[PDB]
Tab-separated table of C-alpha atoms and ligand atoms in Angstrom:
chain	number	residue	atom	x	y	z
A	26	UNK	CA	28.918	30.654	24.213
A	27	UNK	CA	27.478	29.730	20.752
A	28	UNK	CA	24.438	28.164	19.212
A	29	UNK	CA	25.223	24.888	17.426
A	30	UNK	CA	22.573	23.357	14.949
A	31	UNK	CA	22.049	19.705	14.334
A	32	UNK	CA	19.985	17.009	12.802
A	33	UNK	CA	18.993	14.212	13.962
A	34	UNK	CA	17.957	10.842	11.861
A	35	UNK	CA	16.032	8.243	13.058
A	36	UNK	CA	17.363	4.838	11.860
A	37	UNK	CA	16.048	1.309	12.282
A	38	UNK	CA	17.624	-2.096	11.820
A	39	UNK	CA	15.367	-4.849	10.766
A	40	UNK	CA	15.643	-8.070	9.791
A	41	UNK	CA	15.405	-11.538	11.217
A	42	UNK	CA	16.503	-13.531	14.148
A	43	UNK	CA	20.422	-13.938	14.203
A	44	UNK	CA	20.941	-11.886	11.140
A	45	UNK	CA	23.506	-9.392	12.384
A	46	UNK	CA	21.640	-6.320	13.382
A	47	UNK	CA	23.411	-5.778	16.441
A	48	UNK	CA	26.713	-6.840	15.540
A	49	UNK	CA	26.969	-4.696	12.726
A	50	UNK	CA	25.337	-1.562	14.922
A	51	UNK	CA	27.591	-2.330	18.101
A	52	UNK	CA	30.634	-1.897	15.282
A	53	UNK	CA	29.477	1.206	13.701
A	54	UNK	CA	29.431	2.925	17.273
A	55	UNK	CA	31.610	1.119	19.669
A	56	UNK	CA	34.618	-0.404	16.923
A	57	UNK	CA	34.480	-4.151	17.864
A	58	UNK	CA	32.896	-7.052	16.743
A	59	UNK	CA	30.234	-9.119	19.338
A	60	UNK	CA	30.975	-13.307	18.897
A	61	UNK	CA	28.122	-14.068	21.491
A	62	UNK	CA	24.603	-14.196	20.171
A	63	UNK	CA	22.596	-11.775	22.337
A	64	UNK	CA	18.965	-11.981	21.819
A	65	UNK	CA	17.716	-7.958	20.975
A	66	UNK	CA	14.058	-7.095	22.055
A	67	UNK	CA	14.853	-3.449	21.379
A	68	UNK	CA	18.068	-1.496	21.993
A	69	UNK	CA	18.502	2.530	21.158
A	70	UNK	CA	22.339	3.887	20.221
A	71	UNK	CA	23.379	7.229	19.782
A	72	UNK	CA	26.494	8.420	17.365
A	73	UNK	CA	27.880	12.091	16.172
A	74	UNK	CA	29.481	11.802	12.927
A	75	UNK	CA	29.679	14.448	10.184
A	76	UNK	CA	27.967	13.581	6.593
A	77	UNK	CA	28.200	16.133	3.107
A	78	UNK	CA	29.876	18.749	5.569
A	79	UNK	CA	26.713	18.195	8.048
A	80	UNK	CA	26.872	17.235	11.723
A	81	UNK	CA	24.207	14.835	12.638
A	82	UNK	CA	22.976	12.560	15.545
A	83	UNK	CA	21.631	9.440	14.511
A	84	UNK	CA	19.534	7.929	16.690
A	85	UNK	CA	19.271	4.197	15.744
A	86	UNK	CA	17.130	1.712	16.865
A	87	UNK	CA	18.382	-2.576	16.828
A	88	UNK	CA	15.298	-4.397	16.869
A	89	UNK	CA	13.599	-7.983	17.607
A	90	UNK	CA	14.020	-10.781	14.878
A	91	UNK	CA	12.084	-12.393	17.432
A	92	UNK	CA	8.343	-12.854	15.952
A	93	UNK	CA	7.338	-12.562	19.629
A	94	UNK	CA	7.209	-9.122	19.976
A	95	UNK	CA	5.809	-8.534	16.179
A	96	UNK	CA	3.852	-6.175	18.244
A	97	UNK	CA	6.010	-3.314	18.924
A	98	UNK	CA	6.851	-3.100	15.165
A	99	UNK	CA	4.312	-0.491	14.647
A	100	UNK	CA	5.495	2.137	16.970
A	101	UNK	CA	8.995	1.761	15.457
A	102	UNK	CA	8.068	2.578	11.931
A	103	UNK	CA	5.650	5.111	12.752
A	104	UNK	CA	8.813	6.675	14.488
A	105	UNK	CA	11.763	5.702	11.928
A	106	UNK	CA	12.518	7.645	9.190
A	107	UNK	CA	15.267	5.231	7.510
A	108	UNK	CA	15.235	1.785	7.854
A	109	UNK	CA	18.736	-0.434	7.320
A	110	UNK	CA	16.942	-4.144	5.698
A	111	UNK	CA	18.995	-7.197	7.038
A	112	UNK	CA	19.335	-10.170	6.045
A	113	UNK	CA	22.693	-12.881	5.976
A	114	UNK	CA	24.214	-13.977	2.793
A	115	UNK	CA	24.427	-17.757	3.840
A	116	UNK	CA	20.304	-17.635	4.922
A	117	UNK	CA	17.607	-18.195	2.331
A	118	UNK	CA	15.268	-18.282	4.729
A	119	UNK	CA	15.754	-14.584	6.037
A	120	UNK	CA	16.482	-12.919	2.737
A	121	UNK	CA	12.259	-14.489	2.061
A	122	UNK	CA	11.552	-12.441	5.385
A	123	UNK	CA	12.942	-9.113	4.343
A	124	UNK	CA	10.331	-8.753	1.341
A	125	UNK	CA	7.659	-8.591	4.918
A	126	UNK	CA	9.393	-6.004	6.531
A	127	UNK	CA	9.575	-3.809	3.189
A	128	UNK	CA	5.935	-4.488	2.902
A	129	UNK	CA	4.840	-3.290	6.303
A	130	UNK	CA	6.723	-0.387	6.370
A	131	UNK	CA	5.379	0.574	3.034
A	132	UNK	CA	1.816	0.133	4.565
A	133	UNK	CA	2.496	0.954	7.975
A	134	UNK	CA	4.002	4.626	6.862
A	135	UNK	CA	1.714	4.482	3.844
A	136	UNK	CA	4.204	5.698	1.239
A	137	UNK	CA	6.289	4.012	-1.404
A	138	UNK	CA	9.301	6.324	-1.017
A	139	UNK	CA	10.176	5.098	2.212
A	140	UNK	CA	14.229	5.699	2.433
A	141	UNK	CA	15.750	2.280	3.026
A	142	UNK	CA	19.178	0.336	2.179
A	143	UNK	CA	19.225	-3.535	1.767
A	144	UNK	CA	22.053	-4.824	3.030
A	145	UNK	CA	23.360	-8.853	2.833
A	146	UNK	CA	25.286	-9.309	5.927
A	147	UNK	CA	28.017	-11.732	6.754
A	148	UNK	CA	29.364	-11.375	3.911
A	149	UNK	CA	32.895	-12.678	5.140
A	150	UNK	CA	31.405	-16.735	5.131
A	151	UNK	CA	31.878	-19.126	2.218
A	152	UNK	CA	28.810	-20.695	2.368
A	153	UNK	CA	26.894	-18.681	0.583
A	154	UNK	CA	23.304	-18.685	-0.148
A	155	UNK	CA	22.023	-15.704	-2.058
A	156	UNK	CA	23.962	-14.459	-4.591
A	157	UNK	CA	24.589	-10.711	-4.849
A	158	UNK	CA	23.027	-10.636	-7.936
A	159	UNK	CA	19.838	-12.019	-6.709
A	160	UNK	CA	19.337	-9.475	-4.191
A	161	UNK	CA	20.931	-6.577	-6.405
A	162	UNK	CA	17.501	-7.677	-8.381
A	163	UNK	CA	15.548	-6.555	-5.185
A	164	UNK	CA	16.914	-3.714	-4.682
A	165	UNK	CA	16.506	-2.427	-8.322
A	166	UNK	CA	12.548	-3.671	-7.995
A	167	UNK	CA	12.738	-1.791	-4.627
A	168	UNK	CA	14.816	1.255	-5.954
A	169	UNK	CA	16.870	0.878	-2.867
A	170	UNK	CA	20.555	0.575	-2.823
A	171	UNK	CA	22.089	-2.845	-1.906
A	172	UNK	CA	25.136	-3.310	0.029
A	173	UNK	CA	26.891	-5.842	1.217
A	174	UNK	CA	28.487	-6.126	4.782
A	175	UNK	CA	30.374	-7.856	7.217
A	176	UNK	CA	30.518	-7.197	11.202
A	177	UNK	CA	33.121	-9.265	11.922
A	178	UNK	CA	35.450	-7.491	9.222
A	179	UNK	CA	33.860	-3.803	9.702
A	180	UNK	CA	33.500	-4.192	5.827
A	181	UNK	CA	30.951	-2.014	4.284
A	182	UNK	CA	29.517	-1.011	7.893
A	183	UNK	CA	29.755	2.699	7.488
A	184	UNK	CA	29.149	2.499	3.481
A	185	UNK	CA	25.471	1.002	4.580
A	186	UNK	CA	24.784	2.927	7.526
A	187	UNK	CA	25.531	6.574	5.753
A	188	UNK	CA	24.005	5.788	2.784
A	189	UNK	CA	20.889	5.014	4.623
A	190	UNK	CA	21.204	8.666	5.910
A	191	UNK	CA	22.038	9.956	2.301
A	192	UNK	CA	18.792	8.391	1.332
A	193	UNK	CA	16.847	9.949	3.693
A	194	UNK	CA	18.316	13.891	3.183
A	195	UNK	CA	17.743	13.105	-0.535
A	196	UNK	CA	14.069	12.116	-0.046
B	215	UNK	CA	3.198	-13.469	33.862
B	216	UNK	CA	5.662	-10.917	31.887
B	217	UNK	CA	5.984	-7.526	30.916
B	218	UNK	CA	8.655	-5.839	28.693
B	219	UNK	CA	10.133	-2.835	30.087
B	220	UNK	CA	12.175	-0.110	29.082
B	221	UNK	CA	15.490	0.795	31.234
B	222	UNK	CA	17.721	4.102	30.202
B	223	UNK	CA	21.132	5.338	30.819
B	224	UNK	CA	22.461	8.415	31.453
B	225	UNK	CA	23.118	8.681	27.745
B	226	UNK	CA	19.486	8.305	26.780
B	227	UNK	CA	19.585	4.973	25.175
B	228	UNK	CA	18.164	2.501	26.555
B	229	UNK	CA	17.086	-1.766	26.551
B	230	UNK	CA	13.991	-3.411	26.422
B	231	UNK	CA	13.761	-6.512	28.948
B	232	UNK	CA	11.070	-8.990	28.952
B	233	UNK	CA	10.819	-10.180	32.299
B	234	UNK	CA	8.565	-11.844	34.811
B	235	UNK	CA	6.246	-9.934	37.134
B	236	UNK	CA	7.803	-10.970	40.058
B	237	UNK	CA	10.969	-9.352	39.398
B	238	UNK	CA	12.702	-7.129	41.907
B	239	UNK	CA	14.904	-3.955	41.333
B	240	UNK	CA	18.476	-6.205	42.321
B	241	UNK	CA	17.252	-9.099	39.724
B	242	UNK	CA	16.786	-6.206	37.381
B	243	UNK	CA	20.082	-4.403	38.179
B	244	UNK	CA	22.036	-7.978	37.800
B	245	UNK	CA	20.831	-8.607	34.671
B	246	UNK	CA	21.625	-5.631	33.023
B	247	UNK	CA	25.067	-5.880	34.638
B	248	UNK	CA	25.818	-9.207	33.215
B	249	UNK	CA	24.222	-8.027	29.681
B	250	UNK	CA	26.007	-4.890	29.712
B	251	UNK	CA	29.381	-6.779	30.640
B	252	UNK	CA	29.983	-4.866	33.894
B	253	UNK	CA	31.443	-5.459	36.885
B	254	UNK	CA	29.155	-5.861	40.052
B	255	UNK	CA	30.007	-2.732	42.482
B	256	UNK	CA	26.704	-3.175	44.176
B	257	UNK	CA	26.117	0.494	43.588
B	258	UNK	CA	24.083	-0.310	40.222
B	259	UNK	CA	20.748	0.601	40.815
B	260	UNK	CA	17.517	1.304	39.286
B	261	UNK	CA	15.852	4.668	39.532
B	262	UNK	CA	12.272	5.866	39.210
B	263	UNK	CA	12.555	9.206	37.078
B	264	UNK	CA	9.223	11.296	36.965
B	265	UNK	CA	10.330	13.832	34.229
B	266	UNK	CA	7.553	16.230	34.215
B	267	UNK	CA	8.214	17.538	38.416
B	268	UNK	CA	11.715	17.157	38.078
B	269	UNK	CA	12.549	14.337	40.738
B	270	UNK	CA	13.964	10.615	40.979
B	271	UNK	CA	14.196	8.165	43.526
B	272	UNK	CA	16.606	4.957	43.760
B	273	UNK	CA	14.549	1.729	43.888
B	274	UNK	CA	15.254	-0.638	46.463
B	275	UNK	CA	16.821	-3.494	46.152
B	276	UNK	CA	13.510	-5.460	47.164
B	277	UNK	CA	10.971	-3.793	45.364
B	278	UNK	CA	9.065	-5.122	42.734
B	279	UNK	CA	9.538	-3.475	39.408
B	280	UNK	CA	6.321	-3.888	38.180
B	281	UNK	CA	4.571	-2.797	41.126
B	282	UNK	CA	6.521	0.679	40.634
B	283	UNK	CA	5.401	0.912	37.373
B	284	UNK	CA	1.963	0.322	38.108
B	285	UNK	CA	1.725	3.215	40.459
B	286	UNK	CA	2.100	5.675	37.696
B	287	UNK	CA	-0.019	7.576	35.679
B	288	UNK	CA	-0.281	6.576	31.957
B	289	UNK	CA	-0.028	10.422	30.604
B	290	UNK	CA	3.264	10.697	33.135
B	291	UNK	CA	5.802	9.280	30.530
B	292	UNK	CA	7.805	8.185	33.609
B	293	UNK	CA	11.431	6.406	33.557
B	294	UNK	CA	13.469	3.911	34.527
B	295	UNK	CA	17.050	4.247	34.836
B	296	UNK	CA	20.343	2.261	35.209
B	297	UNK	CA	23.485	4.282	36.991
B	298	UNK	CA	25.726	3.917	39.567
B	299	UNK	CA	24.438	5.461	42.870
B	300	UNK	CA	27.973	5.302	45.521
B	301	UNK	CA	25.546	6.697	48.429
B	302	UNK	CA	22.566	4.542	48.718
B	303	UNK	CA	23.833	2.466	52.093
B	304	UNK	CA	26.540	4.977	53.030
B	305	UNK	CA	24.732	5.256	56.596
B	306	UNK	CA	25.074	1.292	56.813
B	307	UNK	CA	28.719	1.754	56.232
B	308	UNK	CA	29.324	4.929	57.970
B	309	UNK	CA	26.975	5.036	60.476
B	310	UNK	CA	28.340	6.326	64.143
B	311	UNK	CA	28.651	9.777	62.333
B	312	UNK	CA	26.597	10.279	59.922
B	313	UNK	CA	23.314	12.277	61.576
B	314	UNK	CA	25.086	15.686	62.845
B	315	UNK	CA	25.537	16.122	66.601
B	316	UNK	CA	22.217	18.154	67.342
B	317	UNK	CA	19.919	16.266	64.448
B	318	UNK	CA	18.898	12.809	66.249
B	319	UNK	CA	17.713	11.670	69.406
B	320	UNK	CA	16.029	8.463	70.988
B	321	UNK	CA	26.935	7.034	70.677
B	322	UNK	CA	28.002	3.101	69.649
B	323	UNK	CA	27.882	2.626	65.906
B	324	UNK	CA	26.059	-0.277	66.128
B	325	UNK	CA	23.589	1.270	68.895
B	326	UNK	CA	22.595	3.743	66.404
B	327	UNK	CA	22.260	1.299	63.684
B	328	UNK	CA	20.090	-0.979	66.222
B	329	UNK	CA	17.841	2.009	67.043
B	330	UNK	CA	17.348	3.139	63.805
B	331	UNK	CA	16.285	-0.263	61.967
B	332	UNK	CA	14.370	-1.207	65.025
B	333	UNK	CA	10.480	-1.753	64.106
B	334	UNK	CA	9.221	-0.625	67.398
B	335	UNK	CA	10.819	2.278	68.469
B	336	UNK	CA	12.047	4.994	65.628
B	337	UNK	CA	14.352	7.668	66.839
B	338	UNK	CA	13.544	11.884	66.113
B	339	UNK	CA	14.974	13.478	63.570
B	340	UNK	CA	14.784	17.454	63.898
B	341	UNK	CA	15.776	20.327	62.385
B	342	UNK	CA	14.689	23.591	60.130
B	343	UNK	CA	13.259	22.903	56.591
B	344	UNK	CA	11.593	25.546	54.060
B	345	UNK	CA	8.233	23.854	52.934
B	346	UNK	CA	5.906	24.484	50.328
B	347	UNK	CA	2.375	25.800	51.845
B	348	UNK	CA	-0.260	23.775	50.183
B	349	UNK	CA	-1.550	25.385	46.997
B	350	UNK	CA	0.244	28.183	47.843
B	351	UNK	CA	3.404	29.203	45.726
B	352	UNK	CA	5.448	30.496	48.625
B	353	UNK	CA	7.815	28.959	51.104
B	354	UNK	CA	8.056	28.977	54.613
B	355	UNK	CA	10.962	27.675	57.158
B	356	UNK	CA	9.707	25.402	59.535
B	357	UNK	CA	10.805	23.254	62.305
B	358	UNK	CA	10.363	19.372	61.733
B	359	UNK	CA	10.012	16.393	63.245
B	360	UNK	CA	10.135	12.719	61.606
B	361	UNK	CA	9.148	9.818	63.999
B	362	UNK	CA	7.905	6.194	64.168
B	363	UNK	CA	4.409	7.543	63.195
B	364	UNK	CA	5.063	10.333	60.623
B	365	UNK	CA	6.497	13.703	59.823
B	366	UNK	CA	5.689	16.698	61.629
B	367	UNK	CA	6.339	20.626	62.045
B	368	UNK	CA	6.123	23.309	64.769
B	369	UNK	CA	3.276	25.711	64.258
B	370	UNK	CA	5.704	27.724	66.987
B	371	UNK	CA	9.384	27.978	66.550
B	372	UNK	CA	10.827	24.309	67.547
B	373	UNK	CA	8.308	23.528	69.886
B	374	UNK	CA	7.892	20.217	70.437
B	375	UNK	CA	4.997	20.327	72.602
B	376	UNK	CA	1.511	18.779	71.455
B	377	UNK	CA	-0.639	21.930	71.473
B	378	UNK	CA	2.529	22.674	68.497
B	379	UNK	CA	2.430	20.033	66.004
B	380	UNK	CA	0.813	19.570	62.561
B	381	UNK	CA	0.947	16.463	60.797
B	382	UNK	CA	2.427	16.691	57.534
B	383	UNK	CA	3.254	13.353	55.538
B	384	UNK	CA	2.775	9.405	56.134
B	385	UNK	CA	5.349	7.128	54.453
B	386	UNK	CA	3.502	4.042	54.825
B	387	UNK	CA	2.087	5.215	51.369
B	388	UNK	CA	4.043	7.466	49.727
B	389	UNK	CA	8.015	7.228	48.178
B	390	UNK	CA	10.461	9.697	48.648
B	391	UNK	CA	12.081	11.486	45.695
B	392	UNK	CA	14.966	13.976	45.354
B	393	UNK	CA	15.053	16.754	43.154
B	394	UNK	CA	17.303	16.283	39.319
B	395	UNK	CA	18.692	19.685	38.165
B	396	UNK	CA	15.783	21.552	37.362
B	397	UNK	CA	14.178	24.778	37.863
B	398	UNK	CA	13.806	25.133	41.376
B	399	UNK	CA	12.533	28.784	40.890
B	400	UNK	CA	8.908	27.434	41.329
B	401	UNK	CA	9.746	29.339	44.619
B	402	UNK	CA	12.238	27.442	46.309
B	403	UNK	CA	14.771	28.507	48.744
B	404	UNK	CA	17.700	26.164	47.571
B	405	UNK	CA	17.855	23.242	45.009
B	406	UNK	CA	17.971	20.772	47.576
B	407	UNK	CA	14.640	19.774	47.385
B	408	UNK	CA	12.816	16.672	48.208
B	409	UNK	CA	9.282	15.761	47.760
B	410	UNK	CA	6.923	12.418	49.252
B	411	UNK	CA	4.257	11.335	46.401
B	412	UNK	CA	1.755	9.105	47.640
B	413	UNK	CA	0.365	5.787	45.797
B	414	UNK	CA	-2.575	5.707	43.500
B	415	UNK	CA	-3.688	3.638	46.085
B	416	UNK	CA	-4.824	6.199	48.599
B	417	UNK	CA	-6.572	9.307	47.542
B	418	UNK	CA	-5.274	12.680	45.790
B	419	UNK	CA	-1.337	12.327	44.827
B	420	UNK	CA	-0.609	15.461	45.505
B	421	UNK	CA	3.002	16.234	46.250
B	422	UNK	CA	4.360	17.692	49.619
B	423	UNK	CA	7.157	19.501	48.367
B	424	UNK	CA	10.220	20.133	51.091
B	425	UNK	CA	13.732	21.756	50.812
B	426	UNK	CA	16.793	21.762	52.519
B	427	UNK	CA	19.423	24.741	53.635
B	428	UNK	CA	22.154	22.369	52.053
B	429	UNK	CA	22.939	18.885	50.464
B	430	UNK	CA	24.005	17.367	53.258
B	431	UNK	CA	20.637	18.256	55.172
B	432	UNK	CA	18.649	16.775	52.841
B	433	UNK	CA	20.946	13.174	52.637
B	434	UNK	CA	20.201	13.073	56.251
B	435	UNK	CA	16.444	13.576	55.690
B	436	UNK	CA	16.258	11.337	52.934
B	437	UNK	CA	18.210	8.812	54.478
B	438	UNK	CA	16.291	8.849	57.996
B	439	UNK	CA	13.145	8.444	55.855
B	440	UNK	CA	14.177	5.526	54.465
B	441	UNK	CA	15.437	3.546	57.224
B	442	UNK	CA	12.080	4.798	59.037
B	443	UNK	CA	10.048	3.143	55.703
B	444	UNK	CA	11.273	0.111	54.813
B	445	UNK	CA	13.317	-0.484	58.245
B	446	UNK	CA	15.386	-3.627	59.039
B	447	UNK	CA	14.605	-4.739	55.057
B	448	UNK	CA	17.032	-2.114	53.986
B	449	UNK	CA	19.602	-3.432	56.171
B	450	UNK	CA	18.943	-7.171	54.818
B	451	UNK	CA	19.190	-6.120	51.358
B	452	UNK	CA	22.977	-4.399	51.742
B	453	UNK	CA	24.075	-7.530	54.263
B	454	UNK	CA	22.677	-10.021	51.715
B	455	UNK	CA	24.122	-8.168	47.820
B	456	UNK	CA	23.345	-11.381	46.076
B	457	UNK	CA	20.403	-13.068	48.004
B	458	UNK	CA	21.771	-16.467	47.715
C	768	GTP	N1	30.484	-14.532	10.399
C	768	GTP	C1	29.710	-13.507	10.782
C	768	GTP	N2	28.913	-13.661	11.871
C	768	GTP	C2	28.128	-12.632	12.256
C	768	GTP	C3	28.146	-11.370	11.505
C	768	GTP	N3	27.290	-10.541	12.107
C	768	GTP	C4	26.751	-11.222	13.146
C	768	GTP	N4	27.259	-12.471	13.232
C	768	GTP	C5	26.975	-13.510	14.248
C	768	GTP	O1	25.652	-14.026	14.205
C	768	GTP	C6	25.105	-14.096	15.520
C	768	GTP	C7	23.867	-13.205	15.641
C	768	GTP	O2	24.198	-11.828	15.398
C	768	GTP	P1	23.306	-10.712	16.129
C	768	GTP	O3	23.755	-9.345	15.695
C	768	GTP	O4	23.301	-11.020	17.609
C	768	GTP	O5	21.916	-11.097	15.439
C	768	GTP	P2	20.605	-10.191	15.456
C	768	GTP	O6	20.137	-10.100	14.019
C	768	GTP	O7	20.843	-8.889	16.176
C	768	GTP	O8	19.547	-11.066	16.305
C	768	GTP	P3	18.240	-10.470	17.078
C	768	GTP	O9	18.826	-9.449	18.040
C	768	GTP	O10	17.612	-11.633	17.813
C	768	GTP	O11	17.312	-9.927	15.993
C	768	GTP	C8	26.207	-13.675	16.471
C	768	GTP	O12	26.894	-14.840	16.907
C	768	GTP	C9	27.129	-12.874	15.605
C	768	GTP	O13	28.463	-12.964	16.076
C	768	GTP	C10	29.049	-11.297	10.334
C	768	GTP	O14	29.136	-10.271	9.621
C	768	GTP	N5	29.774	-12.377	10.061
């Protein structure tokens, strides 16, 4: 019939335990939003979309939070080439843990041009507690965007997930 | 006692499990139906996938997980798998009829169940297959015969007689895998091939490659070697879905 080209991207969702990594990748591909908390050890999810007038596949890979399997964290960044940074707006405690991940895919890669978006999940809760500004700071020191999301809304989902792929065809 | 394992779907994606040792193929299938948010058909099953010759086999519901993945080879990049499989205990259901007329030998639906899941007696199953000379690249149709003690083929026509028969695969310690959609052209008569691979835990794997004239032929086949391997435990594990 005809050839059809495609590229694929390789993204990663890290972040701590109860964050919102799956949540917010079960909306991007299947369009609902999960209540339950499912504990991830490692789930893979495949998705067609079109980006700048390109078809891609991205392949994209919901990790552990769970310090557990700390382990298999190696094989996933030697493989990733974009890496969504999670963390919820209304945990202090996780937003401290996402300065780690940054740092050992920096060294695990060895580059400091690694594409990446942070994102502050849950941002539909009143209980905040880190301000936007405080991670917008981050970001800048990163050079990463920043953007804020919610899975139980769908708000900003495909904004963080596509720019994560913009940042990797840029770089 | 744990290991984390990898299961796929048909898709390619796949989940990670961390589970115990002990764990069978159902326990394995039951979980991923209740994570998944299924509905229990009882034709969820597990598969063993070896990519690099092409085949797959469904794991029974008895077998220890981690016992099939310690039978493999650590360059093999071997799979597991999570589908729907409607056949697996279609004999059980079906049973009166399902060996052709001329096939079996040792009419009641229930006699032929009895005789086949029997551990003393085993009925014969006979009938032409195209086999795979050993080494060899070239094919050659053959008349066979599976019994209690093994499979067999004619070195004359169908003859059944002693002076006749070559031995040509135990079961005791090999599986049984059927062939996925790939190039059969590595001489084969049909794409209905179907291959026994013995455990690590004997000598040289190598495969005895086999091939049947139709689908059909080789269900039969692939069926009667089951029942003949793990028996009356098949049986128990389709009369007993849940195990408690
Ligand atoms: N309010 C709110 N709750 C959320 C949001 N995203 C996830 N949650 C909830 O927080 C809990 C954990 O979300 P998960 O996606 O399962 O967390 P996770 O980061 O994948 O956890 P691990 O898989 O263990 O790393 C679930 O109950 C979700 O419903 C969100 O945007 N807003």
């Amino acid at each position: 019939g005809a050839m059809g080209s495609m590229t694929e991207y390789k993204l990663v969702v890290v972040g701590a335990v109860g964050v919102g990594k799956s949540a917010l990748t079960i909306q991007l591909i299947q369009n609902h939003f999960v209540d339950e908390y499912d504990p991830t050890i490692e789930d893979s999810y495949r998705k067609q979309v079109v980006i700048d007038g390109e078809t891609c596949l991205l392949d994209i890979l919901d990790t552990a939070g769970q310090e557990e399997y700390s382990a298999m964290r190696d094989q996933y960044m030697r493989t990733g080439e974009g890496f969504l940074c999670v963390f919820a707006i209304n945990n202090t405690k996780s937003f401290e843990d996402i300065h780690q991940y940054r740092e050992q895919i920096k060294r695990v890669k060895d580059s400091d041009d690694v594409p990446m978006v942070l994102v502050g999940n849950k941002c539909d809760l009143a209980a905040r507690t880190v301000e936007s500004r405080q991670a917008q700071d981050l970001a800048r020191s990163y050079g990463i965007p920043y953007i804020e999301t919610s899975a139980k809304t769908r708000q900003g989902v495909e904004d963080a997930f596509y720019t994560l792929v913009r940042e990797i065809r840029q770089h | 006692k744990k290991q984390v394992i990898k299961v796929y779907s048909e898709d390619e994606t796949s989940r990670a499990l961390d589970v115990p040792s002990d764990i069978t193929a159902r326990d394995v299938c039951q979980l991923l139906i209740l994570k998944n948010h299924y509905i229990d058909d009882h034709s969820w099953t597990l598969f063993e996938h070896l990519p690099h010759i092409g085949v797959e086999r469904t794991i029974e519901d008895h077998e220890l997980v981690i016992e099939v993945l310690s039978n493999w080879g650590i360059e093999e990049e071997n799979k597991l798998y999570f589908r729907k499989n409607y056949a697996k205990y279609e004999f059980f259901k079906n049973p009166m009829y399902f060996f052709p007329e001329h096939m079996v030998s040792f009419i009641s639906p229930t006699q032929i169940l009895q005789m086949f899941l029997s551990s003393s007696t085993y009925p014969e199953i006979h009938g032409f297959l195209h086999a795979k000379e050993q080494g060899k690249k070239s094919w050659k149709k053959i008349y066979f015969f599976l019994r209690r003690s093994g499979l067999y083929f004619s070195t004359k026509g169908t003859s059944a007689a002693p002076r006749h028969l070559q031995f040509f695969s135990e079961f005791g310690n090999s599986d049984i895998y059927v062939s996925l959609a790939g190039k059969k052209k590595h001489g084969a008569p049909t794409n209905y091939g179907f291959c026994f691979k013995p455990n690590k835990a004997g000598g040289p794997r190598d495969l005895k490659m086999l091939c049947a004239e139709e689908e059909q032929s080789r269900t039969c086949w692939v069926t009667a070697i089951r029942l003949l391997k793990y028996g009356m435990q098949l049986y128990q594990n389709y009369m007993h879905p849940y195990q408690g």
